[PDB]
Amino acid sequence: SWDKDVYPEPPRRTPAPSPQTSLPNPITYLTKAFDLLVDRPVTLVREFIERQHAKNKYYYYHREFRRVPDITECHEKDVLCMFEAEMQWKRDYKVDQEIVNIIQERLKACQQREGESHRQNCAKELQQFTQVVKAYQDRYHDLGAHYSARKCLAKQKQRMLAERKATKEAA
């Protein structure tokens, strides 16, 4: 299962076909025969395998880590601060990429479920996608291959100094 809060679904909508025919309805006959001749033994086998696995219990824990402080609280060369700082930053980098993956999966689900009216009821999700990708483009993009943490902080300082000069000139 999953968290439906973080994976939202639109409310379900289903009509009922009303013939207004007299052939009648071969596919209903076929889907009833399909359910009776396919869905029953797989259900019984799944019941069997569920008992055989629920006879004893395992667990896998979600791994959780602490928060070692920052690169900004590390000294000149002094590796024993920088090591914790950069592995903390790199784990934030991987989880941030997977956040972007989750937003894009939401965007694909909104494209498929909303149908051929594209620009209806995806515009808020498109809005938050452009917001988060503006953040990602501004923050992690143009550093290249050998990012460690230091080029990220250099980009940070250079960006906010450029914006400070821009608002100083605009004022």
Binding site: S117, R119, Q120, A123, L126
Partner: protein
Amino acid sequence: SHITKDMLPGPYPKTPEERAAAAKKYNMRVEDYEPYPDDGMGYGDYPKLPDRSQQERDPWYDWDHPDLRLNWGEPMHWDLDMYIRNRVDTSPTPVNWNLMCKHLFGFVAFMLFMFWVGETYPTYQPVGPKQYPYNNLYLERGGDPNKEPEPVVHYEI
């Protein structure tokens, strides 16, 4: 094994002994042995052949090598890897070569020019644009939920 003097150093000169040795070596007619000549492009002293030779050699001779027209002892023209049938077929053409290229270039040039004459001059059956119901079908294009209404209407005609 293989004789050391069945290799091939140096070009044609001088004419008696070297051409006699190449006639004894490459198994050719004496005054049909042709080096390239020596412009220093490498090439050794290997013969020049009539250079097409493979849509030639009409296939009812019943030689040895059935898909190469070999006869086990021909001096084997330098560019043979470009001349196996399935690579380059130099048939005597049914028309020409110049006539071919001139008519092909003329036809393709004329058709592309008529395409340009089409591109500047469209057809249309005489009909105005469609009467989209809600402001050129607004709110269902790219977005804009409450930014700007774009008022444009249609009148019954």
